[PDB]
Amino acid sequence: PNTAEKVDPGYLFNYVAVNWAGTRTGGDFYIPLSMSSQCQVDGGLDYGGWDESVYTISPYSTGNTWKHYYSVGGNNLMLAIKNAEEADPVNHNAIAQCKILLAEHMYEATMLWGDIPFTESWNGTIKYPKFDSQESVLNGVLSLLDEALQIMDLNDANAIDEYDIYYKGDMNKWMTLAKSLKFRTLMVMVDKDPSKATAIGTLLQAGGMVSSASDNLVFPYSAEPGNQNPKYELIELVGGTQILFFASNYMLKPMQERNDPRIPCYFEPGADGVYRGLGNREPAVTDDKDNMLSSVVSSYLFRKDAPELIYSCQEQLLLEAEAYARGLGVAQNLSKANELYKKGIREACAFYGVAEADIDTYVTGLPELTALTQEKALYEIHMQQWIDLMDRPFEEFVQWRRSGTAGNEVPTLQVPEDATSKELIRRWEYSPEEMTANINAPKESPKIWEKLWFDL
Amino acid sequence: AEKVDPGYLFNYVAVNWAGTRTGGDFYIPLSMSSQCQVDGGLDYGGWDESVYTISPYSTGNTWKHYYSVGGNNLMLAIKNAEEADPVNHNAIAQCKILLAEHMYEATMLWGDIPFTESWNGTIKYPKFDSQESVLNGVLSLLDEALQIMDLNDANAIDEYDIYYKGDMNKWMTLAKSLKFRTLMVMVDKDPSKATAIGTLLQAGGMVSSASDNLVFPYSAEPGNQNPKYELIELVGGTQILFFASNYMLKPMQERNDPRIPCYFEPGADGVYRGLGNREPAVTDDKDNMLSSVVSSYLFRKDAPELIYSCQEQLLLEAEAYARGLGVAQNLSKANELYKKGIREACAFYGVAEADIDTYVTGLPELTALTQEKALYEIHMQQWIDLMDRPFEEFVQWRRSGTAGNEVPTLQVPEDATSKELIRRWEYSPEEMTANINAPKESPKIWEKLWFDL
Ligand SMILES: [Cl-]
Ligand code: NA
Ligand code: NA
């Protein structure tokens, strides 16, 4: 923490950004979350055959991911903040930028592990930091974001700019993002802490939150060697043919019932031109000539320059729609909900490259939320959220758990047949290094089916 | 996993292997635990590995490299080369040499490990082979490589061979040298290897000049920078994490070794001075560094990662002649090779020719020493050569002596739990959990491996 000397905040910020994206798109994160959440499937043991399909998350995967949030990301964001505080002139915007990423790092960590270190982390005086409750951590996330919004200065050109790969130092975009991450985090907490409804309402009244694609928080991979999306390498190592990630029936069937024009963007068809999916661990279907008849996840999503989307306007717009449908700090309003639902679906389809005319057709044909019961309207919003997040398995897993209380999650999932667990997965076990080295860690890790605080 | 280019896989392995060897989860554990370097105390480096606390992530990441990243893909590359038309015999040789070297490195950390049953679809949970099996397996792979290799076939891994660009004469020279090195590792525990060592010495054609070195060339190009540079950039670009160990510096000073300025930076007063394990780095009242840090030049972006060197080879040859391993004991020959190896060592680190001459001139002739004292000086030169190559250093230190006569003599770190010097690593968490044929308990870090007496 204080062992390092003078380090440029921008260098550190970008190092964190690159490794964070590398982590989110890596095999020790993307695969566990996609296969365990069942938003994708592995095509059985002959193909993907991922242990994570039956809830076996490797201790290397938890350790590598944990190492990123605490050593690679957290430690260096804190260091960047310290250098920005100590600079002359004080770089207020750099502090805001770094605090927003730090907030998002701790948010992601607690949504996997629940109770985790935070308040005592990155402290030279504390050898072995205590574990904070998820409730503490999530309120800590909100505080960081509010601290960022307070210290930020839109009339100061000084910021992390050349080393800000997200927004190039445009503090209006960081402001817009910080508010949106607040809103998202509040939506995560509001089932367990209903008193958050008020703060949600206040943000909805204020506006100025992520609303179009230019506002997206996205890490841009490129074709340049050295900045290629790790997902490409994953497929190159098995010959360049995408035979590891398959269309899950939990994803494809709802899309087919709604005639969703994203199907060709999310999946490749079978050899006959037909899109067809698979259950968890169901063997991929081939003909006698060994042609693939099952749908695989689109190879386009595993290309070298595939972007890594961290927070999107679709995501925001469908959450706003949900808030109005549920009347969270605002009067229940299915008219406004419908407007935002339609808008979110348009931005979703646009992001994945659906043609304008096909978007129009899809959105036109979808029932107005106005014409449904509040219960059915909310179900359709939740389903659209589930559809939106197939290629964003971390957000998907949060979304699925958040979507319902007392077994009413959308969509309804079955426990994988060959899993030890009798119940659906709800969290990750703690990393081996933290369990060994930290004397203030739990002696025992909670089981993977034990709900986290936010999850009812 | 279907049709894949062997060259693509080979290069992917090479890059990640170098990335692993120069990474903080390998270089730091080995340098700090072996005590060929020190951390300057808790205010500076403050590395847990100084007190033998090797993280379960570090063992897991390293293990993952040898088995998943390296081994699995080398096997896959070999399979694709076997199935190609025409059969790419040289690619197979190239891949087998690297695979041998991967298993060699793994057994020298963990002892008994999977090998014969690894990378097999029919075997869920592979058994652990004895180190003896693995090391003989390493020799077999190298011999298989030398046999299948074809010097009249232009076809090989060339554009994707970052080491030698497909020059199979260099791979031949290397394979023989790795055999020799591996035999030297085994000969204390298995003295019958002396004969095979003798045979290789008679034949020659082993690594002898810098162009023969197996080295991964990092560059200034973003995307191929040495991880050690990033490590120092993250703490401000000033090298305050790796410090001169007294176990390294003092022997160099008593011999007036001209590598001192290449290995270290002097203190602010121009004096080179070292530190004990975990000893706090010394500063003046003005906060200038008076202790010697490891040279920042060694942490530059294009610092090469040396995997097998001609110094290393030449000092081992010198040792073999000094000990009479399959050849008649011969301190004249040993002296010739010792002098030669020291010259190549100093040259590698950029010592000026005149200063090399002075140093080698001033060193006693092995001829004029007892065989015991001559061997001690060879061992000390080997220890000096490997400061910035901590994996090889740790092998070297353990191999250097039997029954507590290692060179140099080391003390156990004060704040370590262990009562004895470190000898191995504990097994990775994933392998202990997932493999039902793994040991229930990991051996303790002070329990000698098979080769180590
Ligand atoms: Cl900048
Ligand atoms: Na829930
Ligand atoms: Na020994």
Amino acid (one-letter) located at A8:
D
Residue B296 corresponds to which tokens in the numbers above? Answer: 């920042």
Structural domains of chain A, with CATH: 1-456 (1.25.40.390)
- How many C-beta atoms lie closer than 10 Å to residue A257's C-beta? 9
> Are B246 and B276 spatial neighbours (Cβ–Cβ below 8 Å)?
yes
Ligand nearest to the CA of B399: 3
What's the CA gap between A310 and B124, in Å, rounded? 37
Which residues from B are below 8 Å from A233, CB to CB?
12
Beta-ladder partners of A248: A278
A404 Cα distance to chain centroid: 18
Q: How far is B419 from chain A (nearest CA, A)?
A: 20
Phi, psi of A322 (to 5 degrees): -60, -45
Closest partner residue to A67 (CB to CB) among B2, B57, B433 is B57
Phi, psi of A311 (to 5 degrees): -145, 130
Q: What is the four-CA torsion angle of A223, A228, A229, A233, rounded to 10 degrees?
A: 110
Q: How far, in Å, are A66, A121, A157 from residue A79 at the CA level?
A: 18, 12, 22
What's the CA gap between B62 and B74, in Å, rounded? 16
What's the CA gap between B345 and A435, in Å, rounded? 44
- Which of B53, B234, B432 is the mutation pick for testing A, counting most A CBs within 10 A? B234
Contact assignment for B433 to A76 by CB distance below 8 Å: no
SS3 B346: helix
Is residue A128 exposed (0-12), middle (13-18) or buried (19+ Cβ within 10 Å)?
exposed
> Are A393 and A53 spatial neighbours (Cβ–Cβ below 8 Å)?
no
What separation in Å is there between the alpha carbon of A409 and the centre of ligand 2? 6
What is the number of alpha carbons within 13 Å of residue A278 lying toward its C-beta?
30
Ligand nearest to the CA of A98: 1
What's the CA gap between B173 and A15, in Å, rounded? 40
What is the number of alpha carbons within 13 Å of residue B224 lying toward its C-beta?
16
Angle (deg, nearest 10), helices B168-186 and B194-203: 150
Contact assignment for A4 to B235 by CB distance below 8 Å: yes
Query: In angstroms, what is the C-alpha Rg of chain A?
Result: 22
Which residues from B are below 8 Å from A64, CB to CB?
57, 61
Cβ neighbours of residue B151 closer than 8 Å, sequence gap 6 or more: B168, B169, B172
Q: How far is A166 from chain B (nearest CA, A)?
A: 20
Contact assignment for B235 to A3 by CB distance below 8 Å: yes
The owner of tokens 């997932």 is: B434
- Bond before B86 cis per omega within 30 degrees: yes
Q: How far, in Å, are A421, A427, A444, B326 from residue A424 at the CA level?
A: 7, 10, 20, 65
Contact assignment for A5 to B238 by CB distance below 8 Å: yes
Q: Nearest residue on chain B to A72, judged by CA atoms?
A: B234
Cβ neighbours of residue A133 closer than 8 Å, sequence gap 6 or more: A115, A453
Q: What is the four-CA torsion angle of A344, A346, A349, A352, rounded to 10 degrees?
A: -80
What's the CA gap between B184 and B201, in Å, rounded? 12
Ligand nearest to the CA of A97: 1
Q: How far, in Å, are A438, B46, B59, B428, B439 from residue B431 at the CA level?
A: 22, 29, 10, 6, 9
Which residues from B are below 8 Å from A65, CB to CB?
none
**Residue pairs spanning A and B at CB distance below 8 A:** 78
What's the CA gap between B376 and B370, in Å, rounded? 10
What separation in Å is there between the alpha carbon of A55 and the centre of ligand 2? 18
Resolution reading in Å: 2.5
In B374-426, DSSP assigns E strands to none
What's the CA gap between B53 and A125, in Å, rounded? 20
Amino acid (one-letter) located at A120:
E
Closest partner residue to B56 (CB to CB) among A224, A237, A436 is A436
Cβ neighbours of residue B14 closer than 8 Å, sequence gap 6 or more: B98, B162, B163, B216
What's the CA gap between B61 and B10, in Å, rounded? 19
What's the CA gap between A428 and A138, in Å, rounded? 17
- How many C-beta atoms lie closer than 10 Å to residue A39's C-beta? 25
For chain A, list residues whose CB is within 8 angstroms of any CB belonging to chain B. 3-7, 11-12, 15, 58-60, 63-64, 67, 76, 224-227, 233, 236-239, 241, 243, 431-433, 436-437
For chain B, list residues whose CB is within 8 angstroms of any CB belonging to chain A. 1-4, 8-9, 12, 43-44, 46, 48, 53, 55-57, 60-61, 64, 73, 222-224, 230, 233-238, 240, 428-430, 433-434
What's the CA gap between A386 and A68, in Å, rounded? 26
Vertex B195, ends B193 and B197: CA angle to 5°?
75
Determination approach: X-ray
